[PDB]
Structure 1
C-alpha cells in the first residue's frame, strides 16, 4: 500500500437542535486564523457565563450519547453555550493538531461579539475534544476552567489499541475503517503548564485510554496545580455521562459552579 495523502473524517449531522431542548439559538459561522469556516450554535441563555463543549474525533456537536446530554445539562444549569463542529467535522469547513485554532476562534468570536455573555468561559471536552480542552486550558488565557473526559494521553498507544479490534471485521468493513486508523503531540508536557482548575474523568472500561495514563497526568499536574481533580469511573470511553448521568452532572455541575461563578 502507498499510504494516504489525506483522510477527512466522516461528516455526521444529527436531527435535533437546541429548539428540541426548548432553548432559542443562532446558527453561526466562525472563521479561524487560518481561514477555516466553522459551523456552530450560539445559545444565549441570558448568562454572563459561557461553556464550550468539544466533541471527539469523527464526531460532531450532535452526538447523542454525550453531546446532546452535555448541551442539555449546560443549558439547564443556566450557562450560555457555544457548540461548534471541529474543522472537517459535521457542518464545518476545512480539510483535515489544528483543533486548538478552532477553539481559539470560538473564544475570540465570543469575546469580540458577546463579551458581556462570556465574562467567564469554561470548556468541557470528550476524547479528542478533551485533549483540545487540556491544550486550551494551558494556551488560551480567556478559559478559566476545564473538564477533560477520556483524554488520550499517548496518542500512538491509543491508536495502536484501536487497531487490535480491526482483525475481526469482514474485509469490506476493514478497508472502510483503516484509513482513519492510519491518520490517527506531547500531551504530558501540559502537566507543567496547566495552572487552572481541571477535572479529569476516565473510565475503567475504556478500551482506548488506560486509567494509568490519565492517573500519571494527574500525579504530575497536581504538584503545580492545586485545583486538578481526578474521577475514575466504571464506564466505557466518553460514556460516563450516559451510564452515570446523575453523578456526572452532579460532579461536573459542582465543578462549574465553583469556577464559573
Structure 2
C-alpha cells in the first residue's frame, strides 16, 4: 500500500489585488508547530468568513476559491484564506488523509481571535469538496465558528474513491498510476467520514450537493442531513443541477443568492 502521500503542490498567480481589494500576507502557526501561509483580507467588517479548499488545490483554486473570495468581499465580509498544510505555500510535507487539517482551521480561527477580535466577532466557514469535510468538522470541534457551508462533501470516502477510478478504466494505466496512490488510500475505508459528526453538530449548516455529482450521491448527503436533523434544527440542504463542486461557476447567481442569505441570517 501507501504510507504517506501528497498531491502535486500548486500555487496560482492571482492576489486579492486583482479583485480590487487590499490584503496582507500572513503566517499562521498551528498547535503542532506547522507554519501555514495565507491571506488576511481586511474588509472593514466585524464578520469573517474562512474559505477552505479541496484536496488537490490551494487558496488560489481558480474553480471555486477565486469566485467565492470575490463573492465574500463584495458582500462586505472579511476573508482569511490560507493553504492547508502540505498545500500551496504552507508548511508540512505530507497530506495523506488530511485528518490534521482541522488543526489548520483551529489555528486560523485562533489567529483571528488573538489579533483581530473586533474583525471576527462572527466567524463562518465555507468548504469545497474535501474542504467541506473540514468545515463540517469545524462546526463540531471549533466553538468560535458560528455557521458553515459545505459544498459537495464526500459522505462515504471509500465509495467516492471507487467512483473516481471508473473514469480511468478505459484509459491507459500510466494515467491511473497518477491517482492510484491517493484513490487506494480512501478506498480501503481507513479515513473517518463526516457521518462521525452527525450528533455533535448543533450549529447552522448549509449542505450543497449536485444532482449530477457522480462522486457524491444526493441520497448519501440526505443521509447526513436527517441524521443531524435529530440534533440540529438549522441544517439546510440544496440540491443543484451541477456536477462536483461546479455549482459556484455553472450556476453562479443561484449559488451567491442562497449562500448569501444563509450567511446574512446566521452571521449575526
The alignment's TM-score, normalised by the length of structure 1, stands at: 0.97
Q: Gapped runs of 5+ residues in structure 1?
A: none
Do the aligned partners of 2:50 and 2:123 also contact (CA within 8 Å) in 1? yes
Separation (CA, whole Å) in 2 of partners of 1:17 and 1:83: 11
Q: Give CA deviations for 1:67-98 in whole Å, capped at 9, x if unaligned.
A: 11000000000000000011111111102211
Q: Equivalent residue for 2:189?
A: none
Structure 2: give runs of 5+ residues left out of the alignment: 187-191
CA distance in 2, matches of 1:86, 1:235: 26
Distance in 1, matches of 2:126 and 2:193, equals 20
Counterpart of 2:58 in 1: which secondary structure? coil
TM-fit CA distance, 1:57? 0.5
Q: Using the alignment, how far apart are the partners of 1:213 and 1:12 within structure 2?
A: 31
Alignment RMSD? 1.0
CA distances 1:151-188 after superposition (whole Å, capped 9, x unpaired)? 01111111111122222222322222222212330321
Is residue 165–residue 176 contact of structure 2 (8 Å, CA) maintained in 1?
no
Alignment partner for residue 28 of structure 1, among 23, 26, 29? Answer: 26
SS at match of 1:165: helix
In structure 1, what is the Cα distance between the partners aligned to 2:123 and 2:262?
13
Structure 1 position 130, deviation (Å): 0.4
Which deviates more from structure 2 when the two are superposed, residues 128-137 or residues 89-98?
A: 89-98
2:201 pairs with one of 194, 200, 205: 194
Of the three residues 125, 128, 138, the one matched with 1:123 is 125
Q: Which has the larger displacement, 95-104 or 178-187?
A: 178-187
**1: CA distance, partners of 2:221 / 2:54:** 17
Provide, for residues 119-158 of structure 1, a one-character-per-residue CA deviation record: whole Å limited to 9, x for no partner: 0000000011101000000110000000000001111111
Q: TM-score, normalised by structure 2?
A: 0.94
Query: Aligned pairs, how many?
Result: 259
* Alpha-carbon offset, residue 238 of structure 1: 0.7
